[PDB]
Amino acid sequence: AHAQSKREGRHSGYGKRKGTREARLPSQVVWIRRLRVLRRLLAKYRDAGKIDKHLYHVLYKES
Amino acid sequence: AAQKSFRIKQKMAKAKKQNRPLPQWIRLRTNNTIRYNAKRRNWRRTKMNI
Amino acid sequence: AQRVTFRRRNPYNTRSNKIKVVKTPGGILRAQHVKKLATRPKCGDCGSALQGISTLRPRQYATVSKTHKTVSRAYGGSRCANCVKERIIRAFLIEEQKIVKKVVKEQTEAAK
Amino acid sequence: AREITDIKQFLELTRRADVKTATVKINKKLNKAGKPFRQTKFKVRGSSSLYTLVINDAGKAKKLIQSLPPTLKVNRL
Amino acid sequence: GRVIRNQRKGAGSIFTSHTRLRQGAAKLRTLDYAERHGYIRGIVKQIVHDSGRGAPLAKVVFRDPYKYRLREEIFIANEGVHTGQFIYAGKKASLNVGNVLPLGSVPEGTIVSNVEEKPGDRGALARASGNYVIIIGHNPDENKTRVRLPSGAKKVISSDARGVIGVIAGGGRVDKPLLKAGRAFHKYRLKRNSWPKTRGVAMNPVDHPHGGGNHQHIGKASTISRGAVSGQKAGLIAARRTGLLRG
Amino acid sequence: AKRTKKVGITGKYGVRYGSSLRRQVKKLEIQQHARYDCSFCGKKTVKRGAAGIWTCSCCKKTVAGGAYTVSTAAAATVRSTIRRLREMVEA
RNA sequence: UCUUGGUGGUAGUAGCAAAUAUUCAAAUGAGAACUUUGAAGACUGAAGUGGGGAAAGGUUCCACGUCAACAGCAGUUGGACGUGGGUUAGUCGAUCCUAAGAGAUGGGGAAGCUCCGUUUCAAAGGCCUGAUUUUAUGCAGGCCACCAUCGAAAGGGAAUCCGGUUAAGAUUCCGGAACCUGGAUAUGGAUUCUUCACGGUAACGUAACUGAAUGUGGAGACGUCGGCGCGAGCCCUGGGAGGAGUUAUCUUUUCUUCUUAACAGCUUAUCACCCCGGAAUUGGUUUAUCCGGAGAUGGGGUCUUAUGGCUGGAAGAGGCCAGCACCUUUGCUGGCUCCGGUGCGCUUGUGACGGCCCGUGAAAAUCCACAGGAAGGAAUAGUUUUCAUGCCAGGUCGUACUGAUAACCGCAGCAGGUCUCCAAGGUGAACAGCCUCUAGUUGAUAGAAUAAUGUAGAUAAGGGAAGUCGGCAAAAUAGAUCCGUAACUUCGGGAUAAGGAUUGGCUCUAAGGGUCGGGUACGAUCAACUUAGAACUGGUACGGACAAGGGGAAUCUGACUGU
RNA sequence: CUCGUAGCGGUUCUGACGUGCAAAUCGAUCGUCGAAUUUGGGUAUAGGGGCGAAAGACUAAUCGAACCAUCUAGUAGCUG
Ligand SMILES: [Mg+2]
Ligand SMILES: [Mg+2]
Ligand SMILES: [Mg+2]
Ligand SMILES: [Mg+2]
Ligand SMILES: [Mg+2]
Ligand SMILES: [Mg+2]
Ligand SMILES: [Mg+2]
Ligand SMILES: [Mg+2]
Ligand SMILES: [Mg+2]
Ligand SMILES: [Mg+2]
Ligand SMILES: [Mg+2]
Ligand SMILES: [Mg+2]
Ligand SMILES: [Mg+2]
Ligand SMILES: [Mg+2]
Ligand SMILES: [Mg+2]
Ligand SMILES: [Mg+2]
Ligand SMILES: [Mg+2]
Ligand SMILES: [Mg+2]
Ligand SMILES: [Mg+2]
Ligand SMILES: [Mg+2]
Ligand SMILES: [Mg+2]
Ligand SMILES: [Mg+2]
Ligand SMILES: [Mg+2]
Ligand SMILES: [Mg+2]
Ligand SMILES: [Mg+2]
Ligand SMILES: [Mg+2]
Ligand SMILES: [Mg+2]
Ligand SMILES: [Mg+2]
Ligand SMILES: [Mg+2]
Ligand SMILES: [Mg+2]
Ligand SMILES: [Mg+2]
Ligand SMILES: [Mg+2]
Ligand SMILES: [Mg+2]
Ligand SMILES: [Mg+2]
Ligand SMILES: [Mg+2]
Ligand SMILES: [Mg+2]
Ligand SMILES: [Mg+2]
Ligand SMILES: [Mg+2]
Ligand SMILES: [Mg+2]
Ligand SMILES: [Mg+2]
Ligand SMILES: [Mg+2]
Ligand SMILES: [Mg+2]
Ligand SMILES: [Mg+2]
Ligand SMILES: [Mg+2]
Ligand SMILES: [Mg+2]
Ligand SMILES: [Mg+2]
Ligand SMILES: [Mg+2]
Ligand SMILES: [Mg+2]
Ligand SMILES: [Mg+2]
Ligand SMILES: [Mg+2]
Ligand SMILES: [Mg+2]
Ligand SMILES: [Mg+2]
Ligand SMILES: [Mg+2]
Ligand SMILES: [Mg+2]
Ligand SMILES: [Mg+2]
Ligand SMILES: [Mg+2]
Ligand SMILES: [Mg+2]
Ligand SMILES: [Mg+2]
Ligand SMILES: [Mg+2]
Ligand SMILES: [Mg+2]
Ligand SMILES: [Mg+2]
Ligand SMILES: [Mg+2]
Ligand SMILES: [Mg+2]
Ligand SMILES: [Mg+2]
Ligand SMILES: [Mg+2]
Ligand SMILES: [Mg+2]
Ligand SMILES: [Mg+2]
Ligand SMILES: [Mg+2]
Ligand SMILES: [Mg+2]
Ligand SMILES: [Mg+2]
Ligand SMILES: [Mg+2]
Ligand SMILES: [Mg+2]
Ligand SMILES: [Mg+2]
Ligand SMILES: [Mg+2]
Ligand SMILES: [Mg+2]
Ligand SMILES: [Mg+2]
Ligand SMILES: [Mg+2]
Ligand SMILES: [Mg+2]
Ligand SMILES: [Mg+2]
Ligand SMILES: [Mg+2]
Ligand SMILES: [Mg+2]
Ligand SMILES: [Mg+2]
Ligand SMILES: [Mg+2]
Ligand SMILES: [Mg+2]
Ligand SMILES: [Mg+2]
Ligand SMILES: [Mg+2]
Ligand SMILES: [Mg+2]
Ligand SMILES: [Mg+2]
Ligand SMILES: [Mg+2]
Ligand SMILES: [Mg+2]
Ligand SMILES: [Mg+2]
Ligand SMILES: [Mg+2]
Ligand SMILES: [Mg+2]
Ligand SMILES: [Mg+2]
Ligand SMILES: [Mg+2]
Ligand SMILES: [Mg+2]
Ligand SMILES: [Mg+2]
Ligand SMILES: [Mg+2]
Ligand SMILES: [Mg+2]
Ligand SMILES: [Mg+2]
Ligand SMILES: [Mg+2]
Ligand SMILES: [Mg+2]
Ligand SMILES: [Mg+2]
Ligand SMILES: [Mg+2]
Ligand SMILES: [Mg+2]
Ligand SMILES: [Mg+2]
Ligand SMILES: [Mg+2]
Ligand SMILES: [Mg+2]
Ligand SMILES: [Mg+2]
Ligand SMILES: [Mg+2]
Ligand SMILES: [Mg+2]
Ligand SMILES: [Mg+2]
Ligand SMILES: [Mg+2]
8 A cells, every 4th residue: 555655656755765766766777768768869860761871870879 | 513524433332331420229339439430531621522 | 466485595685696587387487597698609800799699608609500599690609791792792702902012013023 | 318309219219228207297287368388298217318299180199109118117197 | 022014024925926827937949059150030929918028929830850749938028029920030130020039140230139138047137028139239259249238238248138118018008197005905915915015114112123103203314234133234235326316 | 077176097096195185196096097009909998907918909919018007208218228229230 | 716527496488470371171190280191272473482693512412211319399201210322424514725823844043941043044845757668667858936834613615416214314315307526448430641620700610629838817706885777585466276264145266286406508797899881960878977980879799607598417306276085005096286467565685786995895725718839640540538428436634413591601400691584464764663484482499368668660640850969760742744943064964953833544636657659630548655735433532552852941071983 | 076874993081990791891972985995715924933004013811022831949248
């Protein structure tokens, strides 16, 4: 029941956090998730063919 | 030590077989002076020192 | 959760005493002692792991057949098909250079 | 413990003169809609290995268990 | 009245050199007929790191002249020597960095390394990283060669003594501060037990000639006679002068 | 962004050891950690491999060199000296 | 302050108070605070008061009998006493190898006990013959330039797992299923009329597919940290098939079973490689920026088998149930043991990388491969016993138990000390503290009463260091989020400076993914916990227990970390 | 480098105890906690010797020269 309350979003405020934000969820973990999202998307668009290999190479380094 | 030398175990065997009380009929013999075992050894009272 | 023990009398976490918790047909968790991982054989010239050859601990090589231990080329299980190609080419052009050097030295000693 | 998937090699195994025994094990595999069948396992006891032939057809099974060599000791289940 | 720390060093118990991780003794090839009359070609196979030694070590394979096998000699690597380079050793070898030549067969002002003091002792002089020997003279009659040593010493040695062309690799190594006690710890950990050093003025009089007193001071001259004995040579032994190099 | 003003690679040492000692370590750490150009394959891939050992990752070739640089000025001087001596002896 | 022995007073006295804690009944017994069993209550709380081991001990293990002494109360109990029983190995260790080192010999030294030295300045040595009848095979050639031996139950190392089983043994016994070494030895297959295989451009493949001296190479064989990825086991969770709990009420509910070992076959991969191809409009690409005319991307392939999958092992075992037997010999019969998911999770293995070093992180036994080409073999047969099957053997010693608030050392059953492995749920950043599950314990002299003085823990009006040598002791502060952050500085810091706000619950909202596709203007579906915001609500409480910096201005001193 | 567990120490209470649980412990508070780290086992150094990041520290509760035995019933103008 506490897990279901957490999954709705309860008991997760400033009075309930004891670790730092990077202790609770690391900023590098967030970055790795995001960059893998952008790189999977770029690879998908290149392999489909709606993005060519030069706009891919600009957007890969921009990501 | 549970991983013994044979020589260690052989002295253990001798000490085990000497760990017994006096046999009772030796107290009945003619001109006996022995009352008890004066070389009796326990694991809790005196170590046999290898 | 079930907890396990070392099965041999070594109690320490050495290289030779590595374990693996496995579940048995009797439903329980037992430690299983793991042998050390085999290292692949290396090229005698460049040092890279050379392909095709079975990766065994060294006394296990006496039990497998010759096929697992050998490539069917010259220097088969010793060198790595690029070092072999390099040494064939190095050989051949050096004897051709040797006969050119022989003829040139003979000419410059028979001319002056 | 090896799996022979060839009836010719299995009948060749049963007469190798180190073989004395073979068990015949009946399993029952009733799946959802595919095959509600009983499966037989002929396991012949060599000196070094135990060879198993799995036969999923019962008519194919009955002719094999009838066709086993006569001197060979068969255990059933 | 106690035997002091420098007197305990000669007993060689805990003051031995730490020799497990070293590759072997670095020597020249033996002075045989091939090097005495012609040359021989070896091959650099590896340039490896020797523990406790600032200079890298070349492993050079020669063919055995009298048996069919290979001889691996351990050289001190000269700067510029690379793996796969042929090394030529002998009287007839050429002036190339890494080549091993007798010093009589070598011109003037030539930079050499791993120099024999006597012909056949297989390398004695200019072995530390960055060090070299200048050839500063030749006396062909009763064959002798004047060399300059890394300490500045002039020295006449035999022309049949062999050296290796080039400087020893690893130079500039003492140009870095260690910055910290742990880098000196790991430096001396694979040399020998000679660090850390307690000062003798910081000891009791039983431990050192400089020991004792109500302030840390020496109290007699730190300059000791050459004709002094063990236990007395703790200071500046046989000093011709002292103090800063200031005129 | 430019994270440090002048400490560079010596920013691992914090405030310790003295600024002159850190500036002296800086010029040799930049040199020993720099990638150098291989004389054999033309690629700038030579790393340091326990000082005096300068290994190219591609082409797998190892050169004996200085402790913190692949070449020292003294060794370049010595190569020019041996080149001049060899050229004036065998000519 | 004699020596040895004995005995007093003090004195039925000081004391037997750390480790939260016991209680009721029955049984046994002469006798029960303390034994056993039931019941209740608690604790250790997985860095355990649990399960095993290393050293050490040595029978303490287990059963039966038993209480004079010992267990600083008791005792019917016991690590006590008396009497027995118990330790099963080709596969686990030793044994073997070398390590730092120890140490013979040869030789030198020393009056000598002995010292040095360890390959030295020694005449230091034993191995196959290519396979047989003048051979107990040598009286044939031929090779090796090495040089005692000891030294690790944590290094290296041939090979075994599961299930059952005892009062006490088990990777050792039994049952089934393997594997290794050494030996003997046939059969089948392969190979030979081109004598010592064939295929693929290749990387390489295969059931085999001669190979001496000698040489070469590999494995053995290796640091540490970081993130990443993958696997295993654990944890979490859905469906279903059983069993138990709760049920005044609610709860498709709470707990629990749902397993698959060594070994074997077939498959399976990062890396690496090969073929085609020829690249600037530079492309591929990792969390981390490396790679490409020294041939990239791309398109085909090859490989190692870490690891996983399927199958065999093997469901016949193990587990959960049902029904009937109910001093039944002692069971018998039957059913189910199935299908998923999830992830910065925990532990561990591992891969490819990166960083660090004036530090670059053992050796040997042992096994294999290659190079070479000595020698030998093709017609009712030789070779390989590196292919398959078959036959025989595997010795010696250790093995019980504790491993510690009672089995070890500390004069003892001593709050000390003594090396290591495994590791559930919640809160929470957390292997913190706190509570619980499995397992274990409930042991430590007790009972009554509640004086002073103690020890340990606290609270305190008003003042706030006036106390004291000195703020000693205590209090204050504390997590996290947001704001703000001076002097000085070696420009790295100082810094969490200083200071200041916010924090619960409930109900919502908004973001942030994965699978999913195209014509020679389109979304089903699945899953997670992070952050931000808002309303409402309350005796303005909210890091509500636990956990958790006091700060600043300066001076002397030693640079720092360290000892 | 830092905060802080485990670990490793040992600041302060000059707390407890001080015929102790203990010939050095107990409790709280502290230092440090990824390396000059901590530690097992093997090995080496032996008494005027060793070893010492130095305190005359430590070398089996022994250290400004360990322990054992002998010389030795050492000698004492000193004490009983
Ligand atoms: Mg809430
Ligand atoms: Mg909240
Ligand atoms: Mg709160
Ligand atoms: Mg926190
Ligand atoms: Mg975290
Ligand atoms: Mg970051
Ligand atoms: Mg023995
Ligand atoms: Mg004891
Ligand atoms: Mg292969
Ligand atoms: Mg001394
Ligand atoms: Mg001394
Ligand atoms: Mg000294
Ligand atoms: Mg030495
Ligand atoms: Mg030193
Ligand atoms: Mg100094
Ligand atoms: Mg000094
Ligand atoms: Mg002093
Ligand atoms: Mg003093
Ligand atoms: Mg003196
Ligand atoms: Mg002095
Ligand atoms: Mg001074
Ligand atoms: Mg003097
Ligand atoms: Mg008296
Ligand atoms: Mg007396
Ligand atoms: Mg008395
Ligand atoms: Mg009394
Ligand atoms: Mg009393
Ligand atoms: Mg008391
Ligand atoms: Mg108590
Ligand atoms: Mg009763
Ligand atoms: Mg009571
Ligand atoms: Mg009760
Ligand atoms: Mg509790
Ligand atoms: Mg018992
Ligand atoms: Mg009794
Ligand atoms: Mg009593
Ligand atoms: Mg009594
Ligand atoms: Mg009792
Ligand atoms: Mg008893
Ligand atoms: Mg007994
Ligand atoms: Mg008995
Ligand atoms: Mg074994
Ligand atoms: Mg040996
Ligand atoms: Mg000796
Ligand atoms: Mg002599
Ligand atoms: Mg011995
Ligand atoms: Mg041995
Ligand atoms: Mg061993
Ligand atoms: Mg090792
Ligand atoms: Mg071992
Ligand atoms: Mg072995
Ligand atoms: Mg078993
Ligand atoms: Mg047992
Ligand atoms: Mg079998
Ligand atoms: Mg096999
Ligand atoms: Mg074939
Ligand atoms: Mg190999
Ligand atoms: Mg590291
Ligand atoms: Mg680091
Ligand atoms: Mg998984
Ligand atoms: Mg097995
Ligand atoms: Mg196995
Ligand atoms: Mg490609
Ligand atoms: Mg670990
Ligand atoms: Mg062999
Ligand atoms: Mg070969
Ligand atoms: Mg063989
Ligand atoms: Mg036996
Ligand atoms: Mg035995
Ligand atoms: Mg046993
Ligand atoms: Mg046991
Ligand atoms: Mg045990
Ligand atoms: Mg136990
Ligand atoms: Mg014991
Ligand atoms: Mg004792
Ligand atoms: Mg005591
Ligand atoms: Mg105790
Ligand atoms: Mg005790
Ligand atoms: Mg916790
Ligand atoms: Mg419980
Ligand atoms: Mg008590
Ligand atoms: Mg007040
Ligand atoms: Mg007040
Ligand atoms: Mg005030
Ligand atoms: Mg005031
Ligand atoms: Mg005052
Ligand atoms: Mg006053
Ligand atoms: Mg004051
Ligand atoms: Mg005070
Ligand atoms: Mg205070
Ligand atoms: Mg914040
Ligand atoms: Mg602040
Ligand atoms: Mg300040
Ligand atoms: Mg604010
Ligand atoms: Mg809230
Ligand atoms: Mg002062
Ligand atoms: Mg200081
Ligand atoms: Mg630190
Ligand atoms: Mg710290
Ligand atoms: Mg304390
Ligand atoms: Mg006190
Ligand atoms: Mg602390
Ligand atoms: Mg401190
Ligand atoms: Mg610190
Ligand atoms: Mg820290
Ligand atoms: Mg750190
Ligand atoms: Mg020892
Ligand atoms: Mg010693
Ligand atoms: Mg003396
Ligand atoms: Mg002292
Ligand atoms: Mg004495
Ligand atoms: Mg006398
Ligand atoms: Mg007297």
